Amino acid sequence: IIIATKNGKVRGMQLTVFGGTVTAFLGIPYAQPPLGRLRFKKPQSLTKWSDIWNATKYANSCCQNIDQSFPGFHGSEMWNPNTDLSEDCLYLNVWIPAPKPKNATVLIWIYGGGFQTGTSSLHVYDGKFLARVERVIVVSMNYRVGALGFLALPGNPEAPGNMGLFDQQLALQWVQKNIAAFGGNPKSVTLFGESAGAASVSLHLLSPGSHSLFTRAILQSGSFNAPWAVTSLYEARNRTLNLAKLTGCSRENETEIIKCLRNKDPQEILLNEAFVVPYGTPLSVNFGPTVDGDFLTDMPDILLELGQFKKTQILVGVNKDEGTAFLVYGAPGFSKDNNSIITRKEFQEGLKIFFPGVSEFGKESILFHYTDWVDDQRPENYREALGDVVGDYNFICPALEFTKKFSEWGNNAFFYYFEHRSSKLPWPEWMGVMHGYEIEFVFGLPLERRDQYTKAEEILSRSIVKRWANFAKYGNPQETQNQSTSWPVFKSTEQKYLTLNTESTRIMTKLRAQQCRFWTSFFPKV
Ligand SMILES: *[C@@H]1O[C@H](CO[C@@H]2O[C@@H](C)[C@@H](O)[C@@H](O)[C@@H]2O)[C@@H](O[C@@H]2O[C@H](CO)[C@@H](O)[C@H](O)[C@H]2NC(C)=O)[C@H](O)[C@H]1NC(C)=O
Numbered sequence: 001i002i003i004a005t006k007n008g009k010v011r012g013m014q015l016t017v018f019g020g021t022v023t024a025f026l027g028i029p030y031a032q033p034p035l036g037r038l039r040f041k042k043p044q045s046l047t048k049w050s051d052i053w054n055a056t057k058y059a060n061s062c063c064q065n066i067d068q069s070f071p072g073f074h075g076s077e078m079w080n081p082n083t084d085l086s087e088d089c090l091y092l093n094v095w096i097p098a099p100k101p102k103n104a105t106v107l108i109w110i111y112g113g114g115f116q117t118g119t120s121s122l123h124v125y126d127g128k129f130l131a132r133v134e135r136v137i138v139v140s141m142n143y144r145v146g147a148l149g150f151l152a153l154p155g156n157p158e159a160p161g162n163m164g165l166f167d168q169q170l171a172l173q174w175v176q177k178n179i180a181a182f183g184g185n186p187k188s189v190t191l192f193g194e195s196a197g198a199a200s201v202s203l204h205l206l207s208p209g210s211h212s213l214f215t216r217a218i219l220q221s222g223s224f225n226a227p228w229a230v231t232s233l234y235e236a237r238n239r240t241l242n243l244a245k246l247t248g249c250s251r252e253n254e255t256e257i258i259k260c261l262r263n264k265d266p267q268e269i270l271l272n273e274a275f276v277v278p279y280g281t282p283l284s285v286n287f288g289p290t291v292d293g294d295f296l297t298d299m300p301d302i303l304l305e306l307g308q309f310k311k312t313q314i315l316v317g318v319n320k321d322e323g324t325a326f327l328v329y330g331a332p333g334f335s336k337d338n339n340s341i342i343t344r345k346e347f348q349e350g351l352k353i354f355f356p357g358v359s360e361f362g363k364e365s366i367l368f369h370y371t372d373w374v375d376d377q378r379p380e381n382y383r384e385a386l387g388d389v390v391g392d393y394n395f396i397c398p399a400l401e402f403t404k405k406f407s408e409w410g411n412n413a414f415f416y417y418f419e420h421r422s423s424k425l426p427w428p429e430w431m432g433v434m435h436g437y438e439i440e441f442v443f444g445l446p447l448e449r450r451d452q453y454t455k456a457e458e459i460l461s462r463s464i465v466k467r468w469a470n471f472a473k474y475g476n477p478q479e480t481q482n483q484s485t486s487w488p489v490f491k492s493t494e495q496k497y498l499t500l501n502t503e504s505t506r507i508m509t510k511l512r513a514q515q516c517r518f519w520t521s522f523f524p525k526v
């Protein structure tokens, strides 16, 4: 229960899972805490310790603003931090099977949260089930978010940008140098993440310094080519300066400003982080990944178009109702407490919320493409139309476009369409299969019969858990034993994908073909 690592020994704890044992190492540091002079800087390597580090509780979560739109509501508060917020926050967790495996495949989770929020200690990121059921090692890390993680003065090493991405990268190399001591195989490492974590995974495929740190990639409801995923260098410096003025650190040496921001307290930075965005939407990434010339050597849409990425297998997918989650955070006429039937005027007001800096012609083209009804008389026409708009534009169509262009360079790609609505889902039914609510099924939470899931959900999570693990281990996300539907590869031509539900798992073709031709081919012009 004590493992010797390259920086010192760590003590774990035993866990009882499904009549078996999993050994958990919660809260292993992987960098010098980025405090004082080290704020906004790339993570510094960690120096030796001679103690026995007790890794028996989740460590701090990094500083972040917290969702307060629904106090006391589990649907929003399950995503909020469940440990103390602190700049001292670069730690990681390890779940290994008991008894110690000999050469186990490693799954590295990268959480999402719009690059502004998130923590690895969330209940739905508990990797003890995957270690128990599939005999893999699960690793997750905290990375810096918000301004503290992605504030950028491009070229300036006091604030170069992409610090959170380098946090992730340093965790990946920790697994490279250390996971063998835990019985893991550093040569079979599979990254997987959701939303902003899925966008991080896709950027690790593009950044050269990470190509040796992992084997395969899984992308859940996100990719770097999504419109929220990358901050342009214009936007990047404009928001850094807005933050500088908003806290009285405005100056003209550019290191000037960083040293002044370095002595403000974290809560002041977090307070003014919220307002640096000129055209703010619920999907706005206040401080995100930039083209920094270090992690990102070029504009990532160019690298993807010209095949400049790690050649390997990918598993990509999306949920049925990606967009609904965001409609009750700003769209008029929407509420989680009624059926949110909205009118045409409310739909048009919703597009101005989600596309504030867009042409009036652009907004009409959105309404033109999405308001051709099979039924002029269905009252929920506009309600669902706005949800599909936000989902197709921000998540579904960028993920499909990333998969085609990645597969065009010869690698096996697998695409899924998750359409099961959790039986325990706390949000209303009109929101459907929401953004982020496949995560629990991936992590095997319905396998716990103690916790209120239907038996069909147990079998569905059990099959997903096998497909994900077979993808990590073997690069082929099949369930080979129980007469399952064979998951075909995604090709540029036929574009086959697998649907995941409790009823019938089916092969289908060309997901959202018409909608995505609008968003990917035409809309980038307006
Ligand atoms: C940070 O950006 C805002 C927004 O700039 C506008 O929007 C851009 C997308 C682009 O169209 C620019 O040419 C525009 O100037 C800067 O300016 C504010 O812009 C908004 C709307 O235009 C509005 O609040 C004010 O007119 C502008 N405020 C001021 C003080 O001029 C803002 O100044 C930028 N931050 C800087 C320059 O430090």
Ligand SMILES: *[C@@H]1O[C@H](CO[C@@H]2O[C@@H](C)[C@@H](O)[C@@H](O)[C@@H]2O)[C@@H](O[C@@H]2O[C@H](CO)[C@@H](O)[C@H](O)[C@H]2NC(C)=O)[C@H](O)[C@H]1NC(C)=O
Pocket: 331, 332, 333, 334, 335, 337, 338, 339, 340, 341
């Ligand atoms: C659904 O609810 C929204 C939100 O209204 C709030 O939540 C309700 C459940 C109730 O507690 C209200 O008192 C709250 O104000 C409704 O949107 C509001 O509608 C009224 C009248 O149309 C309008 O004056 C407000 O500005 C609206 N709030 C907005 C746009 O944010 C909506 O009408 C409800 N729809 C249905 C079908 O019940």
Ligand SMILES: CCCCN[C@@H](Cc1c[nH]c2ccccc12)C(=O)NCC[C@H]1CC[C@H](N(C)C)CC1
Pocket: 067, 079, 113, 114, 115, 116, 117, 195, 228, 274, 277, 279, 280, 281, 282, 283, 284, 285, 286, 325, 326, 329, 435
């Ligand atoms: C004007 C600047 C706004 C701040 N910018 C964003 C930061 C962000 C957080 N999560 C993201 C997910 C994607 C993109 C971006 C974000 C923001 O706070 N959105 C409103 C808050 C809630 C938070 C929970 C989300 N899901 C659980 C549904 C929905 C939105």
Ligand SMILES: *[C@@H]1O[C@H](CO[C@@H]2O[C@@H](C)[C@@H](O)[C@@H](O)[C@@H]2O)[C@@H](O)[C@H](O)[C@H]1NC(C)=O
Pocket: 052, 054, 056
């Ligand atoms: C590290 O932990 C040592 C042993 O702790 C044991 O496990 C924890 C979970 C508690 O139940 C404790 O009562 C057990 O004895 C400690 O002896 C040691 O002091 C700890 N080190 C530090 C620096 O706190």
Ligand SMILES: *[C@@H]1O[C@H](CO)[C@@H](O)[C@H](O)[C@H]1NC(C)=O
Pocket: 102, 103, 185, 187, 188
């Ligand atoms: C683990 O597997 C790799 C190949 O993936 C092999 O090179 C390595 O020697 C193995 N280590 C063991 C069995 O300890």
Ligand SMILES: *[C@@H]1O[C@H](CO)[C@@H](O)[C@H](O)[C@H]1NC(C)=O
Pocket: 253, 254, 255, 256
């Ligand atoms: C001010 O800027 C110069 C370059 O313009 C830089 O060399 C110097 O270090 C900056 N000031 C401080 C205190 O670092």
Ligand SMILES: *[C@@H]1O[C@H](CO)[C@@H](O)[C@H](O)[C@H]1NC(C)=O
Pocket: 462, 463, 466, 479, 481, 482
């Ligand atoms: C296969 O089916 C059996 C029941 O016959 C079930 O117990 C098992 O969990 C299933 N395995 C997978 C990987 O779904």
